[PDB]
Amino acid sequence: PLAKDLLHPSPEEEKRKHKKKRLVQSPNSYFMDVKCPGCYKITTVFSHAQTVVLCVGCSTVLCQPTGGKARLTEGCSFRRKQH
Amino acid sequence: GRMHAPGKGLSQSALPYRRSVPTWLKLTSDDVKEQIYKLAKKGLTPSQIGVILRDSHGVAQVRFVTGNKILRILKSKGLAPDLPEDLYHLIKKAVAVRKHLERNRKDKDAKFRLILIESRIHRLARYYKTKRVLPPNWKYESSTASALV
Amino acid sequence: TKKRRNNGRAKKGRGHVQPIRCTNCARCVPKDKAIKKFVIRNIVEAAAVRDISEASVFDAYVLPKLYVKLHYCVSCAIHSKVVRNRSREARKDRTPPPRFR
Amino acid sequence: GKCRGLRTARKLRSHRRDQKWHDKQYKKAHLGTALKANPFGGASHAKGIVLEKVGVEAKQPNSAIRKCVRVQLIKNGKKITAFVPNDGCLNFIEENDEVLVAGFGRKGHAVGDIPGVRFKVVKVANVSLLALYKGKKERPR
Amino acid sequence: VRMNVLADALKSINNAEKRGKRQVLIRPCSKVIVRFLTVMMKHGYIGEFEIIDDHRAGKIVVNLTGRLNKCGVISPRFDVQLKDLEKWQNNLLPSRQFGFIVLTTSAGIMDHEEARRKHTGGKILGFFF
RNA sequence: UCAAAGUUUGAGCUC
RNA sequence: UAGUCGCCGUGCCUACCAUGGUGACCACGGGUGACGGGGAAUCAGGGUUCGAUUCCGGAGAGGGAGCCUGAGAAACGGCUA
RNA sequence: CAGCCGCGGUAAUUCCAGCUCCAAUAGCGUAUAUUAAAGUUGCUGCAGUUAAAAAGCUCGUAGUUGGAUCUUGGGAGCGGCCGUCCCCUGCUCGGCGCCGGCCCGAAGCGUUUACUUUGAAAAAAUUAGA
RNA sequence: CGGAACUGAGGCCAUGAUUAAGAGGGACGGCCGGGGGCAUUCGUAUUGCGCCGCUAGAGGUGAAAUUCUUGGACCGGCGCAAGACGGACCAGAGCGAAAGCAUUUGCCAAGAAUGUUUUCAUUAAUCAAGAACGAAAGUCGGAGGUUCGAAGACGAUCAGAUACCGUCGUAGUUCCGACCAUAAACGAUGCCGACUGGCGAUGCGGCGGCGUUAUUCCCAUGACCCGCCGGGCAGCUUCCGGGAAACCAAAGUCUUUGGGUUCCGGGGGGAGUAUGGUUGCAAAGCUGAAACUUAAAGGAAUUGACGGAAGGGCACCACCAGGA
Ligand SMILES: [Mg+2]
Ligand SMILES: [Mg+2]
Ligand SMILES: [Mg+2]
Ligand SMILES: [Mg+2]
Ligand SMILES: [Mg+2]
Ligand SMILES: [Mg+2]
Ligand SMILES: [Mg+2]
Ligand SMILES: [Mg+2]
Ligand SMILES: [Mg+2]
Ligand SMILES: [Mg+2]
Ligand SMILES: [Mg+2]
Ligand SMILES: [Mg+2]
Ligand SMILES: [Mg+2]
Ligand SMILES: [Mg+2]
Ligand SMILES: [Mg+2]
Ligand SMILES: [Mg+2]
Ligand SMILES: [Mg+2]
Ligand SMILES: [Mg+2]
Ligand SMILES: [Mg+2]
Ligand SMILES: [Mg+2]
Ligand SMILES: [Mg+2]
Ligand SMILES: [Mg+2]
Ligand SMILES: [Mg+2]
Ligand SMILES: [Mg+2]
Ligand SMILES: [Mg+2]
Ligand SMILES: [Mg+2]
Ligand SMILES: [Mg+2]
Ligand SMILES: [Mg+2]
Ligand SMILES: [Mg+2]
Ligand SMILES: [Mg+2]
Ligand SMILES: [Mg+2]
Ligand SMILES: [Mg+2]
Ligand SMILES: [Mg+2]
Ligand SMILES: [Zn+2]
């Protein structure tokens, strides 16, 4: 097609572009509220942590870093916070 | 494209447009600084600081949440190193190379990489000489270098 | 003029390969240019096995095989007449024929 | 050009100055070896004495006996095969007579059959060879 | 490294106009470019472009019409006396009737004919017709 | 499943 | 730095100290069938080559050197080698 | 003979003659240096896979070139939404003078180049030119 | 009361620091790869030796001989031996600045690429001079000397062969240490940067998504499976347009001629010669002229003619089968 609304691309599109190549530059990372069933408080983990995020009071471990997104310990819920 | 290699990789951080802080985050700049002081006292770079803050405390950038930046704050409190960390890491790399060559005299590739590394060092060194952080008499000298880490 | 796009070989990313001695000659050919043939074949082919099968003791006892892998040189190939010349146009047709022969 | 920089006047001019010499004709004009080697020394004519008459054979397809004449110049002493042109003009040229010689329109290049002969005779003894061929004037005797 | 933003953009549009493309996205937004487009627009050669502000070097989206044969650039930026203006506009244009040579000046960004009215020489930027 | 195979009046071809 | 000479300023010259200055932005050295300029020829626009030559400036009267005389000469149609 | 291609080996449109015919006309021919023609030295303006052509590869000081970002607009009057004329510094002595103050005039000072416009200044002769 | 230096503590100034580039450097995470070096392990075959078995030929060619051989050859078995080489698995696959890089295991460090809301905030691109690396042959010393094999000899064909065939066989071929810097070192295509068509396949990292299948007993991993993303070796494709054409999504964006920057060519020969300079033990490398001669030298593509190149078809002035 010749005509193409370059100013008005769909959200599905802006998801299926490259990180810089979206109409405006936007990141693919996020923060998240990670929680074990036992301990009380919730950690604020970055999705690409490059760190062993220990829990409050050094009770027990949650993440072990990998390439991209961190794999969570067996039986540890989370909730993707927003702003 | 990269300076001393043929790669042309396009991978880096991409910061978003909103310079505004999120609604959930209520940790102040003063509290973050007291953390900075402890971590700098314990011994840590601005990079590793920025990493930990984004990971545990969920605060990606200090420059965006607060006004000024992390290194300038450290420079205010006198935690900054004698010379910049990247040159620090390069000479340490350089030393390990010359050390491995010392036993292993043949490693020609190691010699080629070493030489390119030193070229890169003096390039940075001239930038920092213009930026007026090193004195005019500073000089990398494989003899004296190993004293510096 | 450029006769072929690949220069009768398969050297696009690499740069050097080990030479081989011809079987019929000993002509040195780069392995990647050199012709490679994996010929597995019965020590007795077809006419012989019918004759030899008479010579076997057991009714229908399987024969082992002769697992060759041949490489020839070029001038030998045309002489031994494994490959024919083709036209400028048919040259690009690099698909081998089906499995009728 | 390729360096289309605003401040590469010098680099350009230098390059040009080097490459003019690769041109065969400029070098021909400005080095002296050609001018000095040429017996004419940048001249149209030159006087000289006839010392012998020579029949030089022509090149292929053509086939002819060209009538040249070995002159020796006075100023240098160099020797030349000046060719006499037209029909029946050689009987006029007597030996030990001064003739004015000119070029042959080629600037240092051989012409056709006569191999290596760039020169032709104009006068003989203050007498135009044309006038003798036409029959206007006579040889002084 | 990328030296001339404008120089990349104007090639991108000429390789659009040859293909009859309808709207074009250009990745680095410069103030000089912006002045340039506004010059051609007031005089009617293209429609209404719109610029995408990122706290960054912006982008620009031009809705292209079909009246533009070429829109060229002159690198390096040569100084131009009023003596040379005629020889430039002679050798650089299709004719004496139409086509323009746009040069920014102390006075401001404007056409060469406006420079002739105002009595103002200056630095050649480029041209179009 | 490869031993070899040389020359040709000077005496006139041609848009 | 201090003097000499010179009509004055200056290694112009003398003496005593200091050890500087130029260089790939082509110095230094070699060549030039080069006195210079105002100009001429050629040309689309750019340019190219020439310019001893009747106007201006310079230098010179066999080779080099030296000098009297004079307001003015290191004069050559003035002298001494 | 023919600058070059070529002509001449017995009907030569190419030589030597005659017969004619062509160009220019008191002038024409020949030679040499040199210039346009030459987008065959190319800044405007050449080439560089195969016609001649890219250093075997990478490092490297001078050289050359280098991202974005800071003033946009405003007031009064004017012409046929549009354009243009009028205006966009600041910090000791007297009069548009007026009832010590205000403004103006004057003196001195202005963070700095390239770029562009003016004038003066340019020996005549020459060139164009009335 | 005015004008110069010095020295105490104020009030106010919105009090003082442009963004973080589909510019770049450096850090981090788990990977990736015949990437490099050193040391370590294994395999057969090989040729040689020792021993045992039957035995008269074995070799080698288009056809033979010199050659080994009844003082036991060749063939087979078991042991020993030294140095090459790591087949087949091996791809229009990967990595390396380039030549090139593949037996096991260990040590050392590095790096392209990927994810990243990691730090600094212009630190960058190309480069005469200068420098590191740079297959084979060649050279100098040792060490080692299994195979092949320049040179050389002889034996064969042949009008000649001081070659092509053969039997021997030297330097060399292997390792360490010293030089050397040349190949069609070819994609015969300099480096960065932008833009303009598809199509399927692939390698790596990353992401998402029914179900199969092992861990077995789920998770979360592994093998399949269907996709998207970055750059990567290649492939196909078209009236994109270019190009003398052969051809190229680049050899494009060129008389509508300028994004940046190096190198380098200007008729053929003479000649990469001479002379000079410099390097090298030598071999030779590098820089690099002129005279003179000469009107053409070449490229792509067309039609012929030829072909001791292939495929088709015919003929008793061809053959075949035969006959005068
Ligand atoms: Mg570079
Ligand atoms: Mg033969
Ligand atoms: Mg004959
Ligand atoms: Mg004048
Ligand atoms: Mg004069
Ligand atoms: Mg003068
Ligand atoms: Mg005189
Ligand atoms: Mg005198
Ligand atoms: Mg007299
Ligand atoms: Mg006189
Ligand atoms: Mg006639
Ligand atoms: Mg011209
Ligand atoms: Mg010329
Ligand atoms: Mg060739
Ligand atoms: Mg060639
Ligand atoms: Mg190259
Ligand atoms: Mg080359
Ligand atoms: Mg810029
Ligand atoms: Mg093996
Ligand atoms: Mg190679
Ligand atoms: Mg150089
Ligand atoms: Mg070698
Ligand atoms: Mg070697
Ligand atoms: Mg030796
Ligand atoms: Mg042999
Ligand atoms: Mg013999
Ligand atoms: Mg042999
Ligand atoms: Mg080579
Ligand atoms: Mg061009
Ligand atoms: Mg030549
Ligand atoms: Mg000839
Ligand atoms: Mg017959
Ligand atoms: Mg028959
Ligand atoms: Zn073959």
Swiss-Prot record, chain D:
Pfam families: Ribosom_S12_S23 (PF00164). The keyword Acetylation applies. Hydroxylation at Pro-61 affects translation termination efficiency. Component of the 40S small ribosomal subunit. Part of the small subunit (SSU) processome, composed of more than 70 proteins and the RNA chaperone small nucleolar RNA (snoRNA) U3. GO terms for cellular component: cytosolic ribosome; nucleolus; rough endoplasmic reticulum; small ribosomal subunit. The keyword DNA-binding does not apply. The modification 3-hydroxyproline is found at P61. The gene is RPS23. It comes from Oryctolagus cuniculus. The modification N6-acetyllysine is found at K134. It is found in: Cytoplasm, Cytosol; Cytoplasm; Rough endoplasmic reticulum; Nucleus, Nucleolus. Residues 1-19 have a biased composition (Basic residues). Keywords: Acetylation, Cytoplasm, Endoplasmic reticulum, Hydroxylation, Isopeptide bond, Nucleus, Ribonucleoprotein, Ribosomal protein, Ubl conjugation. Residues 1-25 are annotated as: Disordered. Disulfide bonds: none annotated. Component of the ribosome, a large ribonucleoprotein complex responsible for the synthesis of proteins in the cell. The small ribosomal subunit (SSU) binds messenger RNAs (mRNAs) and translates the encoded message by selecting cognate aminoacyl-transfer RNA (tRNA) molecules. The large subunit (LSU) contains the ribosomal catalytic site termed the peptidyl transferase center (PTC), which catalyzes the formation of peptide bonds, thereby polymerizing the amino acids delivered by tRNAs into a polypeptide chain. PANTHER family: 30S RIBOSOMAL PROTEIN S12 FAMILY MEMBER. The modification N6-succinyllysine is found at K53. This is Small ribosomal subunit protein uS12. CDD domains: Ribosomal_S23. There is a cross-link at K36 (Glycyl lysine isopeptide (Lys-Gly) (interchain with G-Cter in SUMO2)). GO terms for biological process: translation. InterPro entries: NA-bd_OB-fold, Ribosomal_uS12, Ribosomal_uS12_euk/arc. Belongs to the universal ribosomal protein uS12 family. GO terms for molecular function: structural constituent of ribosome.
